[PDB]
Write a protein that binds this ligand. Structure first.
Ligand SMILES: [Mg+2]
Ligand SMILES: [Mg+2]
Ligand SMILES: [Mg+2]
Ligand SMILES: [Mg+2]
Ligand SMILES: [Mg+2]
Ligand SMILES: [Mg+2]
Ligand SMILES: [Mg+2]
Ligand SMILES: [Mg+2]
Ligand SMILES: [Mg+2]
Ligand SMILES: [Mg+2]
Ligand SMILES: [Mg+2]
Ligand SMILES: [Mg+2]
Ligand SMILES: [Mg+2]
Ligand SMILES: [Mg+2]
Ligand SMILES: [Mg+2]
Ligand SMILES: [Mg+2]
Ligand SMILES: [Mg+2]
Ligand SMILES: [Mg+2]
Ligand SMILES: [Mg+2]
Ligand SMILES: [Mg+2]
Ligand SMILES: [Mg+2]
Ligand SMILES: [Mg+2]
Ligand SMILES: [Mg+2]
Ligand SMILES: [Mg+2]
Ligand SMILES: [Mg+2]
Ligand SMILES: [Mg+2]
Ligand SMILES: [Mg+2]
Ligand SMILES: [Mg+2]
Ligand SMILES: [Mg+2]
Ligand SMILES: [Mg+2]
Ligand SMILES: [Mg+2]
Ligand SMILES: [Mg+2]
Ligand SMILES: [Mg+2]
Ligand SMILES: [Mg+2]
Ligand SMILES: [Mg+2]
Ligand SMILES: [Mg+2]
Ligand SMILES: [Mg+2]
Ligand SMILES: [Mg+2]
Ligand SMILES: [Mg+2]
Ligand SMILES: [Mg+2]
Ligand SMILES: [Mg+2]
Ligand SMILES: [Mg+2]
Ligand SMILES: [Mg+2]
Ligand SMILES: [Mg+2]
Ligand SMILES: [Mg+2]
Ligand SMILES: [Mg+2]
Ligand SMILES: [Mg+2]
Ligand SMILES: [Mg+2]
Ligand SMILES: [Mg+2]
Ligand SMILES: [Mg+2]
Ligand SMILES: [Mg+2]
Ligand SMILES: [Mg+2]
Ligand SMILES: [Mg+2]
Ligand SMILES: [Mg+2]
Ligand SMILES: [Mg+2]
Ligand SMILES: [Mg+2]
Ligand SMILES: [Mg+2]
Ligand SMILES: [Mg+2]
Ligand SMILES: [Mg+2]
Ligand SMILES: [Mg+2]
Ligand SMILES: [Mg+2]
Ligand SMILES: [Mg+2]
Ligand SMILES: [Mg+2]
Ligand SMILES: [Mg+2]
Ligand SMILES: [Mg+2]
Ligand SMILES: [Mg+2]
Ligand SMILES: [Mg+2]
Ligand SMILES: [Mg+2]
Ligand SMILES: [Mg+2]
Ligand SMILES: [Mg+2]
Ligand SMILES: [Mg+2]
Ligand SMILES: [Mg+2]
Ligand SMILES: [Mg+2]
Ligand SMILES: [Mg+2]
Ligand SMILES: [Mg+2]
Ligand SMILES: [Mg+2]
Ligand SMILES: [Mg+2]
Ligand SMILES: [Mg+2]
Ligand SMILES: [Mg+2]
Ligand SMILES: [Mg+2]
Ligand SMILES: [Mg+2]
Ligand SMILES: [Mg+2]
Ligand SMILES: [Mg+2]
Ligand SMILES: [Mg+2]
Ligand SMILES: [Mg+2]
Ligand SMILES: [Mg+2]
Ligand SMILES: [Mg+2]
Ligand SMILES: [Mg+2]
Ligand SMILES: [Mg+2]
Ligand SMILES: [Mg+2]
Ligand SMILES: [Mg+2]
Ligand SMILES: [Mg+2]
Ligand SMILES: [Mg+2]
Ligand SMILES: [Mg+2]
Ligand SMILES: [Mg+2]
Ligand SMILES: [Mg+2]
Ligand SMILES: [Mg+2]
Ligand SMILES: [Mg+2]
Ligand SMILES: [Mg+2]
Ligand SMILES: [Mg+2]
Ligand SMILES: [Mg+2]
Ligand SMILES: [Mg+2]
Ligand SMILES: [Mg+2]
Ligand SMILES: [Mg+2]
Ligand SMILES: [Mg+2]
Ligand SMILES: [Mg+2]
Ligand SMILES: [Mg+2]
Ligand SMILES: [Mg+2]
Lengths: 51, 63, 96, 76
RNA sequence: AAUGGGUCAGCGACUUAUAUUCAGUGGCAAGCUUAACCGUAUAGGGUAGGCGUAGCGAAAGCGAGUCUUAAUAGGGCGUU
RNA sequence: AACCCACUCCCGUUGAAAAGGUAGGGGAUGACUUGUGGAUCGGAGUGAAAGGCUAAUCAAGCUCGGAGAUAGCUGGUUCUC
RNA sequence: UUAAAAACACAGCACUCUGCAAACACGAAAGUGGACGUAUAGGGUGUGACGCCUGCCCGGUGCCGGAAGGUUAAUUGAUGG
RNA sequence: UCGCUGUGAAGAUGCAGUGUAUCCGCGGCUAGACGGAAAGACCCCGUGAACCUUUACUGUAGCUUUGCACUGGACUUUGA
RNA sequence: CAUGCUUGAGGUUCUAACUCUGGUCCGUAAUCCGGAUCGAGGACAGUGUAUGGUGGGCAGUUUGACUGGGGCGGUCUCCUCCUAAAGAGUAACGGAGGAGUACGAAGGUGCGCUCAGACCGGUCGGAAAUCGGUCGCAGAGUAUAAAGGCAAAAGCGCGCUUGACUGCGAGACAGACACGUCGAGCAGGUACGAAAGUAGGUCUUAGUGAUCCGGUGGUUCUGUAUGGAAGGGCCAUCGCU
């Protein structure tokens, strides 16, 4: 079943998004551009551990 | 003797000149499967419902 | 608070906030009450000579509510921006 | 018996009928699918809800090919 | 054809204390009122305290405004 | 036979009696019956064991206290327009 | 004080515990019984004169013996933050 | 303080219709007065109670393991 | 390796602590109790305190509701249709079915395109593969039940991509409350497209669990003499068949 993950900003802020994924099917990480509220720009977010 | 206020009711409701304040429920955990719009509109403080005032005021010993 | 067995309001909503212990030594004074001290000096002690504040108050701030009667001098008391204007408008100084 | 199930009712249908005065943001129809289509001055929600975007009067006209039922806002 | 009563006389069930809220009726009024306690003792004194004259915010704080926010934009609560 | 017991019928059941009587019945030198004095008791005693007995009370005595326990249950609640 | 029996006891049988300051029981403890006894004795458990007999199963749950290894308390306090 | 047939909280001395019938005892019998007696013991309910059981839960007397104390000397094996 | 001063455990021994419900003396006229002295055991036993095991011997309790009486059986939350009487709502241990997920593309946008089936013709297949033609127009498809929808296709393919954005929010629908649903518009930053524009997930309606408590990342807050810190608040998020 899908497991929760965190998406941490590449900037120095501590902002993060949250979602889930299928680890068995797609085993690589996710690199997706999102808006960072603290710096008010679109930056790249990287997968991390929910726990 | 003096009337004793309910301890847990005074930790959840605050008296103001506009009524009684409280926070919203369904915001403690299980937050990923929730929409951002739903989590954004459960964030502030609301006033007590018209039909709820009498029960809460009795617990707070305000009447 | 009983509701027949259903979860009551005082247990259905979350607790929030903390109680400020720093504000227990606080008091606010209107500009209408400034012309009630004995004479021409509004200090922390002179406010307790009248019955305008309690005996356990160390910090006092003056806010704009009403209008200042005569000219008075405030001693060690904070004032808002609007209150400070009317105090000085009616010939009163604001020192220390 | 192995049958005793049902779901809650959803309160769908027409909320404002022809000739009524409306304001922007008013919900006009609650739907599954599009029995009625959005005409002039009417928007469509992601669950096919028809809502008003202008002030005026409901019309409820049938027009065009396909024989579609339209809801529109006109001048009062 | 459900319960109670053989009859008479006597007795027998919404009270009191302390904290409060609303209404009626009074005293003072941007002020009102004292508690213990003194007392020439139902007088008079005692204004420590309580409530009101300002609110918003979880708070620091700022204040006819304030909170949220990057935002004197919007919105919540408050102000004649 | 006395004495100890209590198997059957009937009577009695507001009784002569809050467990009897008449007529029959069992044991009757024994693991017998009995007088006087003494010991063990309330979650305790004693019991050839029936949950029996512990002052006509026993799946936990009686008495006085906590105590006006608690009773979403029955019953009752008094003059007039 | 509605059940006298096929129920309880019983002589006999078996298992098991106990080396004496015994096991066991009543006692906050001192102590007392067991017993002024001593394994042919004392306690518990089942069966129930006598005759002929009492078959198979040690996987479960108990009890008894083993000590190599695994897990394991208070205690101690290396290391890191 | 009658019978019958209906009606009716659904089995009537008391209601409807109808039939019978002077007033009051005594000796007898028990068909009815849902006769008297005991706030049904069967059944269900109460966020009732007792007592009993166990590999229900949470504990506990007793029994038992080890550290420290009361608690010492010597020799030897042995790890640091 | 030798010794040295320490130090965990093991075994043996000694006597002086302790123990004796062993003997004989005294208090004494006494099978109690003390003191003395012989004998035996001996740092063991035993008691205090801390700790693991066992422990219905004993104790305080729990052991749901609906229900054509209770029990047994079944059910208990959510979605779709009928019952349901042409607005909404509407009961039964009434009649029928599904859910406790999926997807980093199965989302956004620009561009482009239409199905199932039938017949005829055509190498091994032959009713059914791929190819050509005509008819057909939705009898196909839609991640997943059923209902309502689908040509600006909401169905199918390709390029670029992250709007499955952050702060809000006029106005409504539902509604005992707590929850729920839709949303134009504004401000920041984006993505596609020449551009008007479209985009705050998926054709829609199921895919879910309050508070308390504890954990993790931030923070113009607080921080019990003072400066810190611990702890608390606020914001984000995790842990319930
Ligand atoms: Mg408190
Ligand atoms: Mg409370
Ligand atoms: Mg509470
Ligand atoms: Mg509380
Ligand atoms: Mg939640
Ligand atoms: Mg939180
Ligand atoms: Mg409940
Ligand atoms: Mg004062
Ligand atoms: Mg329906
Ligand atoms: Mg939309
Ligand atoms: Mg009668
Ligand atoms: Mg009756
Ligand atoms: Mg009656
Ligand atoms: Mg009754
Ligand atoms: Mg009666
Ligand atoms: Mg009296
Ligand atoms: Mg009044
Ligand atoms: Mg008045
Ligand atoms: Mg404002
Ligand atoms: Mg306003
Ligand atoms: Mg007898
Ligand atoms: Mg006879
Ligand atoms: Mg006889
Ligand atoms: Mg005899
Ligand atoms: Mg004899
Ligand atoms: Mg004899
Ligand atoms: Mg005999
Ligand atoms: Mg004798
Ligand atoms: Mg005696
Ligand atoms: Mg006695
Ligand atoms: Mg007792
Ligand atoms: Mg007993
Ligand atoms: Mg017995
Ligand atoms: Mg007994
Ligand atoms: Mg029995
Ligand atoms: Mg007695
Ligand atoms: Mg008796
Ligand atoms: Mg008892
Ligand atoms: Mg009491
Ligand atoms: Mg009583
Ligand atoms: Mg009762
Ligand atoms: Mg009830
Ligand atoms: Mg009754
Ligand atoms: Mg009564
Ligand atoms: Mg008998
Ligand atoms: Mg007999
Ligand atoms: Mg008999
Ligand atoms: Mg017997
Ligand atoms: Mg014994
Ligand atoms: Mg023996
Ligand atoms: Mg025995
Ligand atoms: Mg037997
Ligand atoms: Mg036998
Ligand atoms: Mg026997
Ligand atoms: Mg036999
Ligand atoms: Mg075995
Ligand atoms: Mg074996
Ligand atoms: Mg062993
Ligand atoms: Mg009749
Ligand atoms: Mg009749
Ligand atoms: Mg009659
Ligand atoms: Mg009559
Ligand atoms: Mg009649
Ligand atoms: Mg009549
Ligand atoms: Mg007669
Ligand atoms: Mg008779
Ligand atoms: Mg009779
Ligand atoms: Mg009868
Ligand atoms: Mg009767
Ligand atoms: Mg009663
Ligand atoms: Mg009854
Ligand atoms: Mg219950
Ligand atoms: Mg109940
Ligand atoms: Mg028991
Ligand atoms: Mg247990
Ligand atoms: Mg223990
Ligand atoms: Mg020890
Ligand atoms: Mg002894
Ligand atoms: Mg020892
Ligand atoms: Mg020991
Ligand atoms: Mg010990
Ligand atoms: Mg038990
Ligand atoms: Mg027990
Ligand atoms: Mg028990
Ligand atoms: Mg209790
Ligand atoms: Mg119970
Ligand atoms: Mg329970
Ligand atoms: Mg039930
Ligand atoms: Mg049934
Ligand atoms: Mg019924
Ligand atoms: Mg029935
Ligand atoms: Mg029914
Ligand atoms: Mg019935
Ligand atoms: Mg309808
Ligand atoms: Mg209808
Ligand atoms: Mg409906
Ligand atoms: Mg209904
Ligand atoms: Mg799709
Ligand atoms: Mg369909
Ligand atoms: Mg694409
Ligand atoms: Mg995206
Ligand atoms: Mg928009
Ligand atoms: Mg934009
Ligand atoms: Mg572009
Ligand atoms: Mg709890
Ligand atoms: Mg400090
Ligand atoms: Mg901190
Ligand atoms: Mg949160």
């Amino acid at each position: 079943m899908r497991e929760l993950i965190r998406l941490v900003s590449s900037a120095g802020t501590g902002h993060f998004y949250t979602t889930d994924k299928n680890k068995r099917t797609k085993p690589e990480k996710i690199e997706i551009k999102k808006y960072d509220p603290v710096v008010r720009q679109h930056v790249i977010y990287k997968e991390a551990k929910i726990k | 003797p003096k009337m004793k206020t309910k301890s847990g009711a005074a930790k959840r409701f605050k008296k103001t000149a506009g009524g009684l304040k409280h926070k919203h429920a369904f915001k403690s955990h299980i937050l990923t499967k929730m929409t951002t719009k739903r989590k954004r509109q459960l964030r502030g403080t609301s006033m007590l419902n018209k039909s709820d005032v009498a029960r809460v005021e009795r617990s707070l010993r305000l009447r | 608070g009983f509701e027949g067995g259903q979860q009551p309001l005082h247990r259905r909503l979350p607790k929030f906030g903390f109680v400020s212990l720093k504000a227990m030594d606080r008091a606010e004074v209107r500009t209408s009450e400034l012309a009630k001290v004995e004479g021409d000096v509004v200090s922390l002690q002179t406010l307790k000579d009248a019955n305008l504040i309690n005996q356990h108050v160390q910090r006092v701030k003056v806010m704009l509510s009403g209008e200042v009667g005569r000219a008075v001098t405030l001693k060690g008391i904070a004032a808002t921006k609007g209150a400070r204007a009317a105090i000085e408008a009616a010939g009163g100084k604001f020192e220390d | 018996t192995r049958n005793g199930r049902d779901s809650e009712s959803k309160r769908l249908g027409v909320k404002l009928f022809g000739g009524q005065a409306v304001k922007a943001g008013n919900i006009l129809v609650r739907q599954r699918g599009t029995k009625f289509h959005a005409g002039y001055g009417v928007g469509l929600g992601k669950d096919h809800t028809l809502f008003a975007k202008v002030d005026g009067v409901v019309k409820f006209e049938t027009k065009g090919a396909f024989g579609r039922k339209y809801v529109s806002i006109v001048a009062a």
